[PDB]
């Protein structure tokens, strides 16, 4: 709820034709603008050329936004989501005037689903905190995904980077007799892939041993 | 050459078909046996089969092992060095009697060369190792390493260097002591597999 209201008060800049792929066989592009009665998805044409093949259309949808703005989005059909060719995108106001131009590569705009099954335990010997987790559901090329872990003290900024492929993390500099909340996020790795960090996964809290 | 006389003595182990690839576009297979007078390449049949492909015969060879046994080796032609698909190998005597049967995957029997140009400098009271990967090898960034640290004067410690990293930064090392380092490499998963290479020429440094 807090984060909800936190978003409402935020500050956005200029509108952008934003695009992303969740699994490497889809693509959703969108943008947002203010309302205007008589302005529905039919007013815009989202066309897209793709590696010398003919331009094609994408049916635009309209959805409401918590901040009172409307967003228009198109999701490309599976067959047109090749991961390494220059997809050109074009959007025009029925009045002829162009709204956006953007040439992207699907592999360059990855935004995965957050990781799952984050579980936490203490190492049998040391007693340190050992973190394990599984990669985002139904997503390919797992060994190419790097992560980042956030460690909060029930403190200060502590975020551990995790070499791509590895879904385990053992922490050792933690105070004893303390509750720590962890949460991990994912990202496609270079150089083949590029994109954005995912949302955080459901968190887990855990006490540390009395003395270490 | 003491290492040389040592290998002559060291106890045996069961006969076995062994295969390995060096530069990931080559494959050698072989076995050793009692050098009984008479035998030769002609007395044995060595053929392989890549899936969805025909059985082919391999031109066997024979050479004396340093220890006295005979090594019969076949070396697949370049074009048949396809990695990810299952390779089958049947070595049977001319009499039909079966000898060996091993199904492998080329990418899973890599015995790289040992690293080169290893160097150990000084820092923050710390020691920094740096080295090159086995010369003329592709997929460089798929090779993980391991460093051997053995303190001179009447010992040891070992570090697992992660993939594609050709530099190690050693910390905890007792003051005035003479250390002798070394490094060895092997192909790393998910794609590859294999065995540890030999060591690289070592380097000593007095702290």
């Amino acid at each position: 709820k807090f984060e909800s209201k936190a978003a409402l008060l935020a500050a956005r800049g200029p509108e952008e034709l934003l695009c992303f792929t969740e699994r490497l066989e889809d693509l959703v592009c969108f943008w947002e603008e203010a309302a205007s009665a008589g302005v529905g998805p039919g007013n815009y044409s989202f066309s897209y050329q793709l590696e010398d093949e003919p331009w094609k259309l994408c049916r635009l949808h309209q959805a409401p936004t918590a901040r009172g703005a409307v967003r228009f989005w198109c999701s490309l059909p599976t067959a047109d989501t090749s991961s390494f060719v220059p997809l050109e995108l074009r959007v025009t106001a029925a009045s002829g005037a162009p709204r956006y131009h953007r040439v992207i590569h699907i592999n360059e705009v990855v935004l995965l689903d957050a990781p799952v099954g984050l579980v936490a335990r203490l190492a049998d010997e040391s007693g340190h905190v050992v973190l394990r987790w599984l990669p985002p559901p139904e997503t390919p090329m797992t060994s190419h995904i790097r992560y980042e872990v956030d460690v909060s003290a029930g403190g200060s900024v502590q975020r551990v980077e995790i070499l791509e492929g590895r879904t385990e993390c053992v922490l050792s500099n933690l105070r004893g007799r303390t509750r720590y909340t962890f949460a991990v996020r994912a990202r496609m790795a270079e150089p083949s892939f590029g994109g954005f960090w995912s949302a955080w996964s459901e968190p887990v809290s855990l006490l540390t041993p009395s003395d270490l | 050459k003491f290492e040389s006389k040592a290998a002559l003595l060291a106890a045996r182990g069961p006969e076995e078909l062994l295969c390995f690839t060096e530069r990931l576009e080559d494959l050698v297979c072989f076995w050793e046996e009692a050098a009984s007078a008479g035998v030769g390449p002609g007395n044995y049949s060595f053929s392989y089969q890549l899936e969805d492909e025909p059985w082919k015969l391999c031109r066997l060879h024979q050479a004396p092992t340093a220890r006295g046994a005979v090594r019969f080796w076949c070396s697949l032609p370049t074009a048949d060095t396809s990695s990810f698909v299952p390779l089958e190998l049947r070595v049977t005597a001319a009499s039909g009697a079966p000898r060996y049967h091993r199904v492998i995957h080329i990418n899973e029997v890599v015995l790289l060369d040992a690293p080169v140009g290893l160097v150990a400098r000084l820092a923050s009271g710390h020691v920094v190792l740096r080295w090159l990967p086995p010369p003329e090898t592709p997929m460089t960034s798929h090779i993980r390493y391991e460093v051997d640290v053995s303190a001179g004067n009447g010992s040891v410690q070992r570090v697992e260097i992660l993939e594609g990293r050709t530099e190690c930064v050693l910390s905890n090392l007792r003051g005035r002591t003479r250390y002798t380092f070394a490094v060895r490499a092997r192909m790393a998963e998910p794609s590859f597999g294999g065995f540890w290479s030999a060591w690289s020429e070592p380097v000593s440094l007095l702290t």
């Binding site: 390494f84 083949s192 | 997929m139 460089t140």
Partner: peptide, 16 residues
């Protein structure tokens, strides 16, 4: 699918 191959550092894949 793509036409990949080996190389110095890692996989090289041109659009097949």
């Amino acid at each position: 699918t793509y036409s990949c191959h080996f190389g110095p550092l890692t996989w090289v894949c041109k659009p097949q």
